[PDB]
Amino acid sequence: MAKELKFAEDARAAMLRGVDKLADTVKVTLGPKGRNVVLEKSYGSPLITNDGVTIAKEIELEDHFENMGAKLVSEVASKTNDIAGDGTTTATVLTQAIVREGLKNVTAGANPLGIRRGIELATKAAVEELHNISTVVDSKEAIAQVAAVSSGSDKVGHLIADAMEKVGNDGVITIEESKGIETELDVVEGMQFDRGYLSQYMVTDNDKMEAVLENPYILITDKKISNIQDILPLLEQILQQSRPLLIIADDVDGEALPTLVLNKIRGTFNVVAVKAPGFGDRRKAMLEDIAILTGGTVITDDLGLELKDVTIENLGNASKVVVDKDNTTIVEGSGEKEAIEARVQLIKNQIAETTSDFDREKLQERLAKLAGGVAVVKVGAATETELKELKLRIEDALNATRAAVEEGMVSGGGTALVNVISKVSAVEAEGDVATGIKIVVRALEEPIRQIAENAGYEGSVIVDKLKNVELGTGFNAATGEWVNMVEAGIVDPTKVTRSALQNAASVSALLLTTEAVVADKPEP
Template sequence: MAKQLYFDEEAQRALKRGVDIVANAVKTTLGPRGRNVAIDKKFGAPTVTHDGVTVAKEIELKDPFENMGAQLLKEAATKTNDVAGDGTTTATVLAQSIVHEGLKVVAAGSNPMLIKRGLDKGAEAIVGAIRSLSKPIRDRAEIAHIASISAADREIGDLIAEVMEKVGKDGVITVEESKGVAYETEYTEGMQIDRGYISGYFITNTERQESELEDPYILITDKKISSVQDIVPTLERVLQHTKNFVIIAEDIDGEALATLVVNKMRGTINPLGIKAPGFGDRRKAMLQDIAILTGGTVISEEIGRKLDSVTLDDLGRCRRVVSTKDDTTFIEGKGEESAIHGRIEQIRAQIETTTSDYDREKLQERLAKLAGGVAVIKVGAATEPELKEKKHRVEDALSATRAAVEEGVVPGGGVSLLNAVSSLENVKPANDDERVGIQILRRALEEPTRILAENAGEDGAVIVDTVRRLQKEKGDTTYGYNVLSGEFASMVEQGIIDPAKVTRSAVQNAVSIASMILTTEALITDIPEEKPAVAMPPGGMDY
C-alpha cells in the first residue's frame, strides 16, 4: 500500500494538534473541581467518567498524523496508570506543556536531541527530589485520606482503608459490580486456591454444598493417583490419629477415587480430594506454597520421592479446610513462620525482577495468599452509568493507595512538583540547549497547579505566584491552594496528599513521551483508500 509522509515542522505541528486534542479533553477532569466527561456508547447510556485514562483511551482521531500524536500522549497516561494506578491527568498535563514549549524553541533553532538530554537530566533531579520529599504512611487515617482524595469521595476512602487494614499491604483486593445500591465487602480468610473437590461425594455440608474438615492431615503431590496401593500406607498412618484427610494431586481417579468414596460412605474415613492448582512450573510453585504454609512436603518423583515413602512428617496440617465445587481455602496453616516469611521474600524478589505483567500479576496473587488475605469490594449504584463511574473511582483509589503504601506520600495540590523545581538549580547543563530543556521542565512543573486552579474557576498564574510567595513568608514548603475551600494552607495539615509513586511516574512518563515527540522529524502513514460508491439497486416495478 502507498504511504504518505510529513516532514520537519509540518510533522511536529500535526503531532502537536493530536496531543492538544487528548490533553484538552483529559485535563478537564484534574482535581476535585474537575469536570466529568461523557463518552458515547453505540448501545445504551453514555459512560460518564472523572478518570483521565478512561477519557484518553476512548480517543481515536480521523487524521492519521494527528492520531499519532494522540496515541503517543495516551501512552504517557496509560503507562502511568499501569505503574501507579493514578496520575494519568497529571502526566498528560506535564507532557502537553513540555511539547508546547519544546516545539517553540525547536522552531527557533534549538537542537531537539540536546533539549531531550536537558529534559532527561532535569527529570532525574525531580524524581530524586520527590523521593526525598516523601513521608511513609503511618496509619489507617492516612490511608483513608489518600483513597478519599483519589476517589473524591470520603465513603470510598474509609471503605478502602478498612479493607486494606484487614488484608494487609500484600493482600489481594478485587473490585466487582454489585446488584444492590450500596457498597459491600467480602473477605476470604487464609489461602484460597481455584480448585474445588474432585467428587460431590466428598461434601460434608449438603446445605452449603461444601466439604469442611477440621484439623486434617494434607498429602501434597504432583502425581496422578489411580491405584489405591499408592495411598493405602499413608491412609493407615493417618487413621491412627484422625479420620480427616486431604489429598492434593494432579488428579485422583479409578480405583483410588472409588476406594476413598466407599470408605467415606461407610464412615471409615473423611477424605477430600482436590486437583492441584495451576499448570506446569506455576503448579509446582503453588504446591510448594501450600506445603510451606501447612508445614508439609511436596511428594514428587523429581526430588526422588514416591507415594509409598510418605510419613506423617511429610503431611501438612491446618486448623480447617473448606472446599466448594470451585475453590478450596486453607485456614491457619501450621507451617513454620520463618519458612513462610522466607517464601514471601523470595516471591517479592521475583516480582521486582520479572518483566512480564502477567507473571507479575500471578506472583502478586501468590504473595497475597501467603502473606495477607483476599477481599472483594462490591460496588452498587442506582443506575448503570453511575455504577461504571463509581467502579472506576474505586479502582483508581485502590491503586493510588497501594502506591502510597509502597513509596510514601508528598504534599498534594501540585505543591510537590512546585517544590521539586529548586532541585533543577543543581543540574549542570553541558550547553545552552540543555539549559533550555531544563527551563522547559521548570515551566511544565507549574502546569498541574495552574490547571487545578483554572478548573476551580481561578486564575492559574496568580495562584502559582501566591503559593510561592506564601511558602517564603511562612517558611513552610507544604503551603498550597485548597481548591475545595478556596483557602491557602498547609496541604499536609489539610490532608491533601498524593502518593509519591504517582507523582514520580507522571514526571518520568511525561518527559519520556514529550521527548519522543520533540525528536520526531518524519511521520509515515498509509494513504486512505478511496472506497468506490455503492451502486444503486435497480428500480422496482410500479403496480
C-alpha cells in the first residue's frame, strides 16, 4: 500500500520522537525508588505497575515512524529481559541518550560512520573494563549468598547451592510444586536438550511460554514426519490412553503439523513435537540415549521400524516433560537404570578412546547430560498463594544465581557504569571517533542520574560526588547515604549490565546511520 518515503533529518527526527516517547514512558520506573505507571486494559480494572518490560510491551504509537522507533527499542529490550528483570530498562535509557546526542552532533556535520566507529570502540573498551573489575562469584558460599539475595528468601540459597553442587554449573535444575508444606530438593534421571517447540499453539503455560506435559508418551524417531497418516494408529492408541504425547523427530511439517496444531487447539490431543537434537551420525547418538532413558525405541529405517507400525510399547515414558521456546526438558524417564549406566560407560569408553577434541567434547557433553541428572525442587507451602509466590521467588533467584555464576557480580545501582568512565575516556581517538567516544562518555551517566532524580536527589550532584569517591562505594537511592554497595547488598549481575550496554550501543549505531525510512501512509 501507499508508502511515505522520507529522508534526511526529518525521518531521523520522527525516529527520535518515537524513541523519546518510549523512553519517557519507561525510564520513570528505573531504580528502587521508581514511580508507578498506569496502563489501560480492555476489561477489568486498569493495571498499575512499575515493571518496565510490561509497559514497554504495551506501548503502541499512532504515528507510523514513532511506532517504528517504539518497536525497534522494544525488540532491543527483548534481547535483554531474558536474564534478570532490570536489563530491559537501562538499555532503553542508554539508547535514548546516545540517539539524542548523536543526532544533535550529526546535524552539524560529523560524518555518521565516524560516530558509529567511535561508539563501537567506546563500547568495546567499556565491556573490557567491566570484565576487568568484578567480584568473581565461584565459591560455594558466594553462590549460596547470591541465591540468597534478590528475593531468594533464605532457604533458596542453600537449596540452589546443593542442587548446583549435585548437578554442576550447567546441570539442569527444575522447580516443582510439592503437595506438602515443605520445599524439597531431588535429583533424578532426566534429559534437557536445546530443542524448543515447533509452534506456540501447543504451549501449555501461556504465562511461562513453556509447554508442560505430565506423564506423557514420547515418540523417538530420526525420520521426517510430513504426513499425519503415518501416525494415525498411534494417535488413536494414545487418544484411547488419554495421555500427552511427545514427538521427537527430524522434522514435523507438511500437513501433519497443522493437523496436530488444530487437534491441540481443540483439545483433542495433548501432543508436543520437537526437532531431534544433533545431526548426521551424532543425532542417532543422543536419540538412542533418550530412548534408553525413557524406555522407548528410536523409530529409524536402520532398525526396520515404520511410523505406522509404532505401538504404545515402543514409546518412551517419563513423569514430566517441559518444553520451552528453545529447549526440551525430560524429568524421570521410565527407562532402566542399568541400561542408562551401560550407555554412560560406553560413552566414557568412547571419550577415553576418541582422539578428536571436537568429538571428545561432544561425547563429554552427552556424558555430562546423561550422568548429571536433573535437580528437582518440589516447592511446598501452606497456601496456593504462598506456593505461587515461592515458585516465582525461586525462579528469578535461580536465574540471577546462574547469571552471577557465569560472569560474576559488580556494583549495583549503575555505579559500575560510572566506575568504567575513566577507562573509556582513556581511549585515544581523533575526529568523529573522538566525538563518539565523548558521546558514550556523556551517555554512560544516564542510569545513575535518572535513579537519583527519581528519588528526588539532584542527579548532577550525585554524579560529581560519585566520580570522586573510592571504587566500590556508590549512592544508595533508598536511603540517600553513600555506603559500600557490596556491603549494603546493592549488587547487580555483570552479564545484565554488559548485555544492556552492548544492545543499546549496537542499536544506536544502527539507527544513527539510517538515511531513508519507508513506512505505510496513514489511511484517511
